[PDB]
Write a protein that binds this ligand. Structure first.
Ligand SMILES: CCCCCCCCCCCCCCCCCC(=O)OC[C@H](COP(=O)([O-])OCC(O)COP(=O)([O-])OC[C@@H](COC(=O)CCCCCCCCCCCCCCCCC)OC(=O)CCCCCCCCCCCCCCCCC)OC(=O)CCCCCCCCCCCCCCCCC
Ligand SMILES: CCCCCCCCCCC(CCCCCCCCCC)(CO[C@H]1O[C@@H](CO)[C@H](O[C@@H]2O[C@@H](CO)[C@H](O)[C@@H](O)[C@@H]2O)[C@@H](O)[C@@H]1O)CO[C@H]1O[C@@H](CO)[C@H](O[C@@H]2O[C@@H](CO)[C@H](O)[C@@H](O)[C@@H]2O)[C@@H](O)[C@H]1O
Ligand SMILES: CCCCCCCCCCCCCCCCCC(=O)OC[C@H](COP(=O)(O)OCCN)OC(=O)CCCCCCCCCCCCCCCCC
Ligand SMILES: CCCCCCCCCCCCCCCCCC(=O)OC[C@H](COP(=O)(O)OCCN)OC(=O)CCCCCCCCCCCCCCCCC
Lengths: 92, 179
């Protein structure tokens, strides 16, 4: 029954992981796909804390409109993008 | 009265602070630049900044605590001597003597002007008009700073100015009286 205890710290670790996959990706669509993953990890946390209403509002407008908006923009536009190479980003 | 300073303790604290400032400035210089740079050129094409942040931070507070200890008081002059030492560190980067002398004089004068006003970038809460007794005095009170009276006591002005020039402990006409 105490398998069901660490549920918050789990989603915290998953959010850390998910932003690491935001800022390290090849395509510009792979980053927004991990971003909608980040919204749904957030909405799981918001249900978890005791706010069932918000989680579904976050699904309605954050993997709702603004997701579709960003996916849409990245489709009908060309955007050059380099990779996370060590020779251009170890200086940071 | 006062308390003497630990010159070695304050100097090694400032040495650690100057180290941290040199590290964060070299990290800033890598990223705010152009051309081929990597992890190792943090201290290769650093422009020599960590020596600046280290040497100024040691020399200012060492000269400051040493001057405040050998003079046995705290005023704006200690900031003058410490800013002269800081100008000596910042003047040695350009390897020329009249440059160096100018840095030591002018940075020391600017730091002495900073120290004489209160050595603060902000204000003192007390000891300023909004939070200090001002206006006239009410009775025979000791006239503090910020206050005006109509006639100072003569025994006070003879202590302050002197007993020489024209000022005397008795006015000159009643000093020459017929009895
Ligand atoms: C009254 C005005 C007072 C102020 C201005 C007076 C002018 C001074 C002369 C300046 C000058 O000529 O520099 C040229 C010099 C440029 O060199 P250059 O033009 O290639 O040299 C050719 C010249 O002919 C120089 O070649 P030269 O052979 O003719 O002369 C050699 C040497 C000789 O230096 C002099 O010309 C002055 C010598 C005075 C001697 C006086 C003797 C009698 C008393 O020239 C210098 O290198 C002067 C450097 C002095 C720097 C003083 C910085 C003070 C900052 C004050 C900010 C407030 O300027 C710099 O070195 C860079 C300055 C950049 C700003 C630095 C800011 C640092 C601030 C640190 C903190 C300071 C305190 C802040 C508050 C503290 C509490 C927080
Ligand atoms: C026009 C160009 C000229 C430039 C002048 C600027 C410099 C002016 C500075 C002088 C002044 C501001 C007055 C400015 C008013 C007009 C300013 C005009 C234009 C400003 C541009 C700052 O005085 C500072 O002087 C510094 C060195 O002298 C000290 O350095 C520091 O020292 C170490 C800690 O003390 C630090 O640990 C160290 O780190 C620093 O080194 C500071 O302590 C001190 O606060 C004086 O203010 C103060 O004066 C004293 C009496 O002395 C008054 O208290 C009095 O106490 C009794 C004693 O009788 C009496 O009861 C009575 O008398 C009065 O209650 C105060 O009420 C107060 O007001
Ligand atoms: C324990 C830890 C110990 C260390 C703690 C100390 C931390 C202090 C950090 C100070 C770092 C220095 C700031 C810096 O990195 O400056 C570099 C940056 C660009 O400079 P750069 O490109 O290298 O050279 C171009 C010159 N034309 O310059 C910048 O543009 C950065 C912007 C300035 C930094 C803001 C500081 C605010 C205070 C300014 C001082 C004003 C004092 C007024 C008196
Ligand atoms: C050009 C116009 C622009 C101005 C340029 C000026 C540049 C700055 C010059 C250097 C000024 C810094 C001098 C530091 C003085 C430090 C100090 O504490 O002064 C002490 C003294 C009053 O100190 P006090 O606490 O009252 O006790 C002793 C009283 N005899 O007070 C004094 O000794 C008098 C200090 C002022 C002397 C005038 C300097 C020229 C202004």
């Amino acid at each position: 029954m105490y398998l069901t205890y660490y549920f918050i710290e789990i989603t915290i670790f998953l959010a850390i992981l998910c932003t690491i996959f935001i800022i390290s990706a090849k395509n510009p669509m792979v980053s927004i796909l991990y971003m909608i993953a980040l919204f749904v990890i957030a909405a799981m946390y918001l249900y978890l804390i005791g706010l069932g209403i918000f989680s579904l509002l976050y699904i309605m407008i954050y993997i709702g409109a603004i997701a579709v908006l960003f996916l849409f923009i990245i489709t009908l536009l060309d955007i050059n993008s380099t990779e996370l190479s060590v020779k251009s980003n170890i200086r940071d | 009265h006062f308390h003497p300073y630990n010159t070695l303790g304050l100097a090694t604290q400032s040495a650690m602070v100057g180290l941290g400032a040199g590290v964060v400035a070299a990290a800033a210089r890598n990223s705010l630049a152009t051309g081929p740079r990597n992890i190792l050129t943090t201290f290769s094409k650093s422009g020599g900044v960590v020596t600046i942040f280290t040497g100024a931070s040691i020399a200012y507070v060492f000269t400051y605590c040493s001057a405040a200890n050998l003079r046995e008081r705290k005023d704006g002059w200690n900031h003058m001597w410490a800013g002269a030492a800081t100008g000596a560190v910042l003047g040695a980067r350009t390897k020329l003597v009249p440059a160096f002398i100018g840095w030591t004089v002018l940075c020391g004068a600017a730091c002495g002007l900073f120290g004489w006003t209160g050595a603060r970038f902000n204000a003192d809460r007390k000891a300023s008009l909004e939070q200090s007794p001002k206006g006239f005095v009410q009775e025979d009170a000791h006239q503090t700073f910020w206050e005006v009276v109509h006639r100072r006591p003569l025994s006070l002005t003879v202590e302050q100015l002197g007993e020489g020039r024209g000022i005397n402990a008795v006015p000159i006409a009643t000093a020459t009286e017929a009895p």
